[PDB]
Amino acid sequence: KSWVEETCESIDTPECPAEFESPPTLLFSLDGFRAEYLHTWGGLLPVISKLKNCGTYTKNMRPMYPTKAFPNHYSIVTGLYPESHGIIDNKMYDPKMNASFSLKSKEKFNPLWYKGQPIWVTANHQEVKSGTYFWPGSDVEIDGILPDIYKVYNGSVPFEERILAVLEWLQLPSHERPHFYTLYLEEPDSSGHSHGPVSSEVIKALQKVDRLVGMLMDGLKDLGLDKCLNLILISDHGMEQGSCKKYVYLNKYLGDVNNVKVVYGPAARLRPTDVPETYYSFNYEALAKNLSCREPNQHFRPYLKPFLPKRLHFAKSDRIEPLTFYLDPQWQLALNPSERKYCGSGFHGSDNLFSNMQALFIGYGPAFKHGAEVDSFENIEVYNLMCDLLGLIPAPNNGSHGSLNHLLKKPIYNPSHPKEEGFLSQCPIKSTSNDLGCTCDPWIVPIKDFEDDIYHMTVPYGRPRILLKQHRVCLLQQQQFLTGYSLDLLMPLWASYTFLSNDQFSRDDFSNCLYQDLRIPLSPVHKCSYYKSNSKLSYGFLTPPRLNRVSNHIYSEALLTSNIVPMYQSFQVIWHYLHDTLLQRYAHERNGINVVSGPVFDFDYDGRYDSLEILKQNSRVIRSQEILIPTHFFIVLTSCKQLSETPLECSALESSAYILPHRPDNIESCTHGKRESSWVEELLTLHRARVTDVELITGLSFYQDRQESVSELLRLKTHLPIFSQ
């Protein structure tokens, strides 16, 4: 009898032959196996269906951007974003190397491309052997290390021979046998490209790899290993149907230029042809602006790379061109029709939250649960998991160690909340009152005399913790919100408040009206007079003064100088619509929301909060005062899973996070032709982010006082919703 015909039985303990002290881990990639293939054609794939039903499965493993083979395979084995591990696409130009990378060039074997630490190198350093039958990077000497057994990539090797070789490796004596293995097949990616994802050729390709996995499982059973091996069946990305009618050609807007090179496809990038001499002097911004808002409902958008949504984490590599393009589902871009492959084939590379880009993940073996279906997770999380399976300490990476513990029968690593590394103080009322130059309207109720339940109301999940190392913060308590105030930057790092479903906003105006918070040092850029007619810059509020839960008028404590941030007039359009219109609707839909908002400073576009050194280099002198202008603003919205519960009494949390670019115009949204502001909601959706994304870029940590385990909270904070096509 074959493995697939046996009944599914629980493997609570590894059932291993005498020559095996612990089960190995095998990482098995089916290139271009989009998650939906199993959703729809599972009945035709008996082998992979048994792995899913007898193992641990997610409907969608989220890939990394761009959704191509080399970035994503190397992300899986490093736990790193492509921008950090250096393999940002299958084809790259490095201006400092003055060298081009591609899959059919000898540069593919040059170790200088491959950063980070792949799991076989991690294993080597910790006395664990590896055998790789193809995997990007595995035929390259990385950190002076090669897998104990490896194969130089050769796509012509029959799939059966690859599986048989691994099965022979598993028969090696213990002192030479690897503990970690890889297998890689080019299908169903090959048929998806040549014939499209919805084709009889892809179905044949899916049946072929299903029989090949069965061949693997049958071999393990013959060796007595089918209950002594942790299998991770995975893919690098999904597949989409391209069209010649959904292809953007830049020469429509630029003319038939030849001084630029465009990496064609859905995640296209642009650089001058005269490199490296002009790689940094080229006027990318002028080119980006010439390509912006040219068509109604334009299906491509130019982005200078720091302006891409942070959730993509696609900017901190010199191999990522300063100009990139973001493409709608099914759409691709090239310089002209001669600079691209066939426009009607299957393709991938698009936004890693598009449903058809989602990837496969099944875990099967002693370590994995039986019949468990788990929420989506990113493939950068798998490196830590394989480390736990192999008894390895992981190298530093972007996965959140412990966030996949719910996949395992018995979690290996027990995660902790990060320590608060800030310096916390109390801010005393010890500021001499000064004229702010404000002209408050008569209906603004002043703060004439400045001199537990409220705390829980404003931070019902616990206050955000300051991860910023040695940063000086004091907590400012108000009746309706809590502020984490930076004494080093003289502006608030976050404000937290709860917006109940029946709470009303005030209609009154409050222009050019502030009250000096006598608990903080007075700065010239705290005053109304500084921003008066300041064409360069205005100010905005973290907590909305119109929200007043007790009284009918403007909430005067929200007018404190500790509650304002520098803010462009252009961004005020977004911020005002968010708070005057969207938040009220979200609170109706969610039965209230808790809100935390604040500034972000990521001037070096690495997705992490900036050092003091970096902030000093990016300060601006405006109206004879040094001022630090945020690069983004964050907002985190939290409510209950059960709609009968208000945010102060959640049995379980629902979280939405956003990292909004703080730009001095709204060219990103193409608003010249618009007479209503719903485009603000589209901008929010595009720039949604994991809670963990916000934590990394602000040095803050949320929800630490909740009773859920740390791993459960990591699951909440790493989640990101998929755009359903």
Ligand X SMILES: *[C@@H]1O[C@H](CO)[C@@H](O[C@@H]2O[C@H](CO)[C@@H](O[C@H]3O[C@H](CO)[C@@H](O)[C@H](O)[C@@H]3O)[C@H](O)[C@H]2NC(C)=O)[C@H](O)[C@H]1NC(C)=O
For 133, the enclosing helix (H) or strand (E) is: strand 130-133
Nearer to ligand X, 34 or 313 (CB): 313
Q: Which is nearer to ligand 4BW, 102 or 431 (CB)?
A: 102
Residue count of the chain, please give it: 725
**From residue 666 to residue 705, what is the string marking binding to ligand X with x (rule CB under 6 A)?**
------------------------------x---------
Name the residue with tokens 């690593």. 413
Residue 31: contacted member of Ca ion, ligand NAG, Zn ion, none (CB under 5 to 8 Å, by partner type): Zn ion
Question: Strand 25-30 and strand 230-234: pairing?
Answer: parallel
Residue 91 sits in the site that holds Cl ion (CB under 5 A)? yes
User: Which residue bears the tokens 């909305």?
Assistant: 544
| 624 burial via Cβ count (<10 Å: 0-12, 13-18, 19+) | exposed
| Contact between residue 59 and residue 373 where contact means Cβ atoms under 8 Å apart | yes
Give dist(CA 117, CA 396) in Å, integer: 9
Check binding of 75 to ligand X (CB under 6 A): no
Q: Give the binding range for ligand 4BW (CB under 6 A) out of 189-197, 432-440, 485-493, 716-724.
A: 189-197
Q: Is 32 one of the binding residues for Zn ion (CB under 5 A)?
A: yes
Q: 606, 654, 708, 712: which one contacts Ca ion (CB under 5 A)?
A: 606
Q: Is 68 in the site for ligand 4BW (CB under 6 A)?
A: yes
606 vs 654 by CB, closer to Ca ion: 606
| Residues in region 609-668 near Ca ion by CB under 5 A | 610
Question: Interface with Cl ion includes 298 (CB under 5 A)?
Answer: yes
CA 74, 78, 81: angle at the middle one, nearest 5? 75
Cα 308 off chain centre by? 12
Q: Applying CB under 6 A, which residues contact ligand NAG?
A: 98, 154, 156-158, 276, 286, 289-290
Segment interacting with Cl ion (CB under 5 A) among 423-431, 543-551, 607-615, 703-711: 703-711
Distance between CA atoms of residues 609 and 619, nearest Å: 15
Helix (H) or strand (E) holding 637: strand 632-640
Interface characters, 314-333, with Cl ion (x: CB under 5 A): ---x----------------
Least Å from the CB of residue 272 to Ca ion: 27
Which residue, 228 or 696, is less far from Ca ion as judged by CB? Answer: 696
The stretch among 338-346, 383-391, 393-401, 531-539 that binds ligand X (CB under 6 A) is: 393-401
Question: Between the CA of residue 212 and those of 14, 25, 361, 494, what are the distances in Å?
Answer: 24, 18, 17, 53
By CB under 6 A, tell whether 39 contacts ligand 4BW.
no
Question: Least Å distance between CB 140 and ligand NAG?
Answer: 16
Strand order in the sheet with 300-304: 260-263, 269-272, 323-327, 300-304
What are the CA-CA distances from residue 109 to residues 67, 86, 93, 284 (Å)? 22, 14, 15, 31
Question: Which stretches of 318-397 are assigned E, i.e. beta strand?
Answer: 323-327, 332-334, 346-347, 361-364, 372-374, 377-378
| Token duo for residue 501 | 């479903």
From the CB of 537, what's the least distance to ligand X, in Å?
Answer: 28
What is the spatial distance between Cα 611 and Cα 588, in angstroms, rounded to a whole number? Answer: 39
Q: Which stretch binds ligand X (CB under 6 A): 77-85, 173-181, 286-294, 335-343?
A: 77-85
Q: Which is nearer to ligand 4BW, 103 or 652 (CB)?
A: 103
In eight-state DSSP terms, residue 611 is: P
- Which of ligand 4BW, Zn ion, ligand NAG, none binds 78 (CB below 5-8 Å, type-dependent)? none
Closest CA to 413 of 709, 42, 708: 709
Distance CA 120, CA 383 (A): 11
Kindly state whether residue 210 participates in binding Zn ion, applying the rule CB under 5 A: no
For ligand X, the closer CB: 86 or 242: 86
User: 155: closest CA among 190, 120, 114, 193?
Assistant: 190
Q: How far is the CB of 385 from ligand 4BW (least distance, A)?
A: 22
Q: Which stretch binds ligand 4BW (CB under 6 A): 187-195, 227-235, 285-293, 666-674?
A: 187-195
The nearer residue to Ca ion, 196 or 566, going by C-beta atoms, is 566
Name the residue with the smallest CB distance to ligand X: 607
Token pair, residue 338, equals 């001669």
Please give the Cα distance from 568 to 630 (Å, whole number).
Answer: 10
Helix (H/G/I), strand (E/B), else coil: 676: coil
Binding residue count for ligand X, defined by CB under 6 A: 13
Closest residue to ligand NAG, Cβ-based?
A: 289
Q: Which is nearer to ligand NAG, 156 or 552 (CB)?
A: 156
Tell whether residue 136 is a contact of ligand 4BW (CB under 6 A): yes
Return the residues of window 326-345 that contact ligand 4BW according to CB under 6 A.
341-342, 345
Q: Which of 8, 103, 429, 612 binds ligand 4BW (CB under 6 A)?
A: 103
**Cβ 632 vs Cβ 662: under 8 Å:** yes
What gap in Å lies between CA 47 and CA 6, rounded to an integer? 11
Print the binding letters for residues 657-696 with Cl ion: x by CB under 5 A, - otherwise: ----------------------------------------
- In the bound state with Cl ion, the residue whose beta carbon lies nearer, of 535 and 651, is 651
**Residue 154 contacts which entry, Ca ion, ligand X, ligand NAG, none (Cβ below 5-8 A, type-dependent):** ligand NAG
Least distance in angstroms from the C-beta of 116 to ligand X: 5
Q: Rule CB under 5 A: is residue 604 a binding residue for Ca ion?
A: yes
Report the C-alpha gap between 485 and 505 in whole angstroms. Answer: 25
- Closest CB to ligand 4BW: residue number: 69
- 186 makes contact with ligand 4BW (CB under 6 A): yes
Q: Is residue 662 helix, strand or coil?
A: coil
Could you tell me the sign of the dihedral formed by the alpha carbons of 28, 32, 34, 39, in that order? negative
Beta bridge partners of 654: 639
Q: Are 501 and 588 in contact (CB under 8 A)?
A: yes
608 binds Ca ion (CB under 5 A): yes
Return the structure tokens found at 124. Answer: 């080597």
Q: Which residue lies nearer to Zn ion by CB, 188 or 484?
A: 188
* Spatial distance between the Cα atoms of 196 and 193, rounded to a whole number of angstroms: 6
Interface with Cl ion (CB under 5 A): 86, 91, 93, 295, 298-299, 317, 347-348, 366-367, 706-707
Where on the chain is the footprint of ligand X (CB under 6 A)?
A: 80-81, 84, 115-116, 313, 396-398, 606-608, 696
Binding positions for Ca ion, rule: CB under 5 A:
602, 604, 606, 608, 610
